[PDB]
Design a protein around this ligand. Structure first.
Ligand SMILES: [Ca+2]
Length: 139
């Protein structure tokens, strides 16, 4: 996987400490969570080729997360990989999202809550994962 060196976000659940770094700590038991329309931004160690994103949303069989994914080299000007996606509720395995490869230093997810409530909660994200999951092409 591509090294995530820094994570930032619009906000987070500070009472439970569901901080942005939890999205990239390699532990599916910790999560980032924020309410309302939110965003979480992943900075890689360098600009590099991106071919997949692994997303492990919280309570996936109960809650489908609505989100969009953007990429950038400067962290200021964004291009979409896909907009208005929902995560699957089929199982608890996460999903491997695929797309025409791009070059990026930053990946940003703009999130819109779930079909259950207005929290966005993600256990883990990884970039260029080898997870043994079927490819879900997103655009
Ligand atoms: Ca985590």
């Amino acid at each position: 996987t591509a090294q995530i060196v820094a994570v930032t976000a619009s906000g987070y659940d500070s009472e439970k400490g569901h901080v942005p770094a939890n999205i990239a700590d390699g532990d599916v038991k910790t999560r980032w969570a924020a309410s309302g329309e939110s965003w979480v931004q992943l900075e890689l160690d360098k600009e590099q080729s991106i071919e997949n994103i692994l997303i492990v949303p919280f309570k996936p069989t109960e809650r489908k997360l609505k989100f969009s994914i953007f990429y950038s080299n400067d962290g200021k000007n964004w291009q979409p990989l896909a907009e208005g996606l929902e995560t699957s509720s089929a199982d608890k395995n996460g999903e491997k999202l695929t797309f025409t490869p791009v070059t990026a230093k930053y990946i940003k997810l703009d999130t819109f809550g779930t079909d259950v409530n207005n929290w966005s909660a993600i256990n883990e994200i990884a970039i260029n994962s080898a997870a043994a999951l079927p490819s879900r092409a997103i655009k």
